[PDB]
Design a protein around this ligand. Structure first.
Ligand SMILES: Nc1ncnc2c1ncn2[C@@H]1O[C@H](COP(=O)(O)OP(=O)(O)O)[C@@H](O)[C@H]1O
Ligand SMILES: Nc1ncnc2c1ncn2[C@@H]1O[C@H](COP(=O)(O)OP(=O)(O)O)[C@@H](O)[C@H]1O
Ligand SMILES: Nc1ncnc2c1ncn2[C@@H]1O[C@H](COP(=O)(O)OP(=O)(O)O)[C@@H](O)[C@H]1O
Ligand SMILES: [Mg+2]
Ligand SMILES: [Mg+2]
Ligand SMILES: [Mg+2]
Lengths: 372, 40, 372, 372
């Protein structure tokens, strides 16, 4: 009778809703805004914060902080604010009569999962809660059992291969390059055309520019030459104060950092090389099945050139007698949540919850013996 | 200190960050253990 | 129905079927696989163990164990799994209404035969069972009565001479050098060209390479010189992950261990010397009949150079006034099973079974007083 | 002068010097560094590549590559740079008037040895050169003739048994798990405490942490329980930028991969099981002499708990009526070089060199007919 809750707390956005649905009810940015130190506006008699859409709407007098940096929860009071907002203000529900499903990226600290269990059981006290790996949920939403998931969000980009339901943790790869780094790089490279975005309120404007106008080139040098030749790749964007800006090659130079990290000074390899290295660290008899089942998930995979570019690069790296298939569904931005709704709806999952009695008896360490 | 349960501060260094995180988890577990012991 | 079952449990493969047929119904590898990685997807019909073709197909996430080593059953729970699989899943039969014929290599421990009898009568309880020597069955399938059988499989290589239906047990020879040792030697010597096969899943790949590309040279030194001169003996093999390897002298260096055991550090003599020594230990008046009737059986005799090499070596060892004839039929991989089907169909054999009443009265020791 | 040179090129370090000495003259890391950023200050003795201690000192602006991976030379230009540095810059000698002794791990590709011979005779042309197995040199430095050598360095871990000067090549075991794999595993497991080491410059920091603070537990489960109970096993390390980190169970979880390879996903057995399997593959009459003469060499054997743990494990595996003795001298990090200095000083070795005339007459293949 009790409906289960599915909550996905990424580095940048929170996607929360009810199990059994098709789309999340509440999708809001994972930011906490605090008063600015300029004494311009002191008349707003609040408590001490604004969270979510309210912080974004009032961002002209606020300083915005992200509670999660590179997939790791760094501030826990702000995380409590986010969870309180998504329980009482967005979903409009009382947490004491709904089980909760939470998500976590691979190769995270154990303390993060332990404190998630502790906060969900001692402050927002739920009958049961369960923590799951995001790539397993993405594979659940994709409908298949074997595949390698490239999950790229706002803080991390990780590759996880799974064969017939068994995961290989020694081949799990993690790269600290995601959407926020691309936003910072776009802020850096818009200064070449004379536009100056500095403050955190303008970072959201640059993020909107990136979400609306950027794309991944199939060949980088040819598209750079084409942009240098003619102004056919140039697009115009209207700022909130009515100013109009024009951008050219910056549309495709920004996501190219995902394939050439040295643009921002990182020594690592691109996502295609990382995926190929993750495939090569597995056993020889499963690589063929991983080749045909490259699954893309996350909001950073939403550029309209990335599947063809990934296919071209991986086909260049892999032997010529292999079928390389990139699986990029249109609803892949919320695949983790969709998988969570799938997982929370199974009749065979209802005995795997962690009840409050078990948490009382064992403490905040049963999350390793119960959750993968 | 064994009493403080929440500390609102964004640390810069991972060392103290983890020391703080362990301290808070420890204090909350002291809470848990005394809630378990007082249950007759 | 009472249509007898014929089951041949070798070191590497299981050949099971019904008596009176021409070919075995179920031929599957004798391996048990168990998972070694972490399972993350709930339900989906995951099993704790896999047997036979299913274990071979899913070997990329499994550790594969052979229950039988050098013709001796080392693990009995896995052997029970193999017998349960070959009775209920492959042959699709109920064991309680079918007599069973099993095979065993010469000079095996008595405890192996005793525990085979105990398992067949107390767990998969049959009306009758009979254990036979493999070389006698090989001579049965060849259609003749006099001959010396060289049976080489996956764990053992044994010579048994028989003259007019009488066996000579003092001249029976056994060498613990067979196909699995050649597989291990091929794994060792492929490291010279930079290929590294380590895990048990790659051992099957090396076994496939050996079955497809290896052959026995008529003259070893001349073929080594020919390989050293030109790259005409080199063949290419495609790995499961699309990689292509090239092998040269390793095609004929691997089975040459059967004629020069000192390649793997053994002090024994080759198969030709062992056959000649077995011939010389018999009576003088039957050696001529043994010379003309060399019968080859087993999968290790399937290399396409071995009959001519054996004939050349034995003719070199034997006096020049003798006719040395090697009999290598095309269906010699399943000769033992064919002989078992022949033996179980005879009207003169039906009084030689070991019934359940005899086993109850005598215990698991009548298999020595009844069978050889 | 004709004072022979002894050079040991391992996976991680180069130990070079003159024969007849007690310690190597030049011990330097086997890395080549190349700049990755943009140079703006002209001159100032900037090099396009850096080798050895200079690359390690300037590693904050360099990308470091190891020319040797798992005992196999993968890049040959960098290897030529290393050899040029160790001949002209470190030893300060002219190679054309000094014979050279080089080392190689067992079961390496033949092409590696052939190209080493070709480079030493055609680019740094020596009067003579000789390639030797490292474990034989380790037994040479130990002063005895019979024993089984476990040599574990930065890329390989190999067991070689020798009885009265005769080696048994069929019992030589090789495992591709050594110090660099433990460094990578330590990098992986420090992310559990929130520390992120990604670049190759930070790999040296993690290697330094491993060399200073890690140790092998005598009982793994008891020490894990002790670490979980109290913070008495925790140690602090000061980073190059002044940050202080604390590590607990990671001190002993890192070298435990040498006894439980499944921590990094490998199907193989531990070093104690590998040593016992190497002992069991030899003849029965020499195993007792191998039991009392376990010789440890290499830098991976320098953890201060490994001899007692190896003795306990092997005594658990071996029969109780046997004396198991582990020989771990204090100078075992340079035993191979010491053995090379012993070998190059013998009067009975001077006829076993490969002169330039022999190389001219035979080509780069006499290194197989002369050296093992
Ligand atoms: N259409 C788009 N094109 C490119 N990037 C996008 C698009 N939509 C969203 N993003 C990026 O996806 C990131 C968050 O995606 P998602 O993975 O759903 O959230 P989280 O990372 O919080 O789990 C944001 O930083 C945003 O910049
Ligand atoms: N075409 C072939 N060439 C060489 N060897 C083969 C060939 N086919 C099978 N083998 C070998 O035969 C061995 C098993 O043969 P067989 O005697 O039928 O099984 P078992 O030894 O289990 O009774 C296997 O180890 C395999 O390596
Ligand atoms: N005190 C120590 N404790 C543990 N490991 C060490 C220690 N000193 C060196 N090592 C390891 O030994 C490895 C190299 O040892 P060595 O065998 O001398 O060099 P190579 O492998 O190049 O021949 C390095 O990777 C290093 O991590
Ligand atoms: Mg996410
Ligand atoms: Mg057989
Ligand atoms: Mg070494």
């Amino acid at each position: 009778e009790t409906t289960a809750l599915v909550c996905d707390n990424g580095s940048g956005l929170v996607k929360a809703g009810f199990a059994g649905d098709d789309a999340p009810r509440a999708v809001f940015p994972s930011i906490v805004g605090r008063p600015r130190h300029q004494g311009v506006m002191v008349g707003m008699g609040q408590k001490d914060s604004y969270v979510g859409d309210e912080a974004q709407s009032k961002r002209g007098i606020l300083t915005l902080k992200y509670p999660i940096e590179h997939g790791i929860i760094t501030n826990w009071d702000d995380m409590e604010k986010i969870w309180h907002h998504t329980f009482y203000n967005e979903l409009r529900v009382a947490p004491e009569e709904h089980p909760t499903l939470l998500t976590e990226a691979p190769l995270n600290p154990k303390a993060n999962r332990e404190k998630m269990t502790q906060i969900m059981f001692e402050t927002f006290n739920v009958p049961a809660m369960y923590v799951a790996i995001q790539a397993v949920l993405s594979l659940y939403a994709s409908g298949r059992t074997t595949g390698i998931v490239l999950d790229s969000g706002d803080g991390v980009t990780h590759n996880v291969p799974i064969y017939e339901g068994y995961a290989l943790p020694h081949a799990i790869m993690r790269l600290d390059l995601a959407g926020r780094d691309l936003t910072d790089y776009l802020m850096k490279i818009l200064t070449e055309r004379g536009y100056s975005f500095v403050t955190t309120a303008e970072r959201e404007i640059v993020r909107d520019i990136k979400e609306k106008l950027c794309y991944v080139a199939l060949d980088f040098e040819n598209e750079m030459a084409t942009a240098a030749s003619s102004s056919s790749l140039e697009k115009s964007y209207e700022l909130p104060d009515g100013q109009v800006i024009t951008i050219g090659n910056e549309r495709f130079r920004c996501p190219e950092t995902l394939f050439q990290p040295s643009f921002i000074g990182m020594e690592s390899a691109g996502i295609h090389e990382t995926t190929y290295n993750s495939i090569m660290k597995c056993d020889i008899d499963i690589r063929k099945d991983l080749y045909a089942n490259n699954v893309m998930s996350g909001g950073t995979t939403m550029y309209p050139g990335i599947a063809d570019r990934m296919q071209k690069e991986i086909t260049a790296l892999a032997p010529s007698t292999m079928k390389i298939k990139i699986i990029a569904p249109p609803e892949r931005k919320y695949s983790v949540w969709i998988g969570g709704s799938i997982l929370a709806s199974l009749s065979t999952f209802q005995q795997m919850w962690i009840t409050k009695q078990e948490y009382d008896e064992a403490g905040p360490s049963i999350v390793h013996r119960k959750c993968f | 200190n064994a009493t403080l349960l929440k500390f609102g501060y964004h640390f810069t260094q991972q060392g103290p960050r983890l020391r703080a995180s362990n301290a808070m988890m420890n204090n909350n577990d002291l809470v848990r253990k005394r809630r378990l012991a007082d249950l007759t």
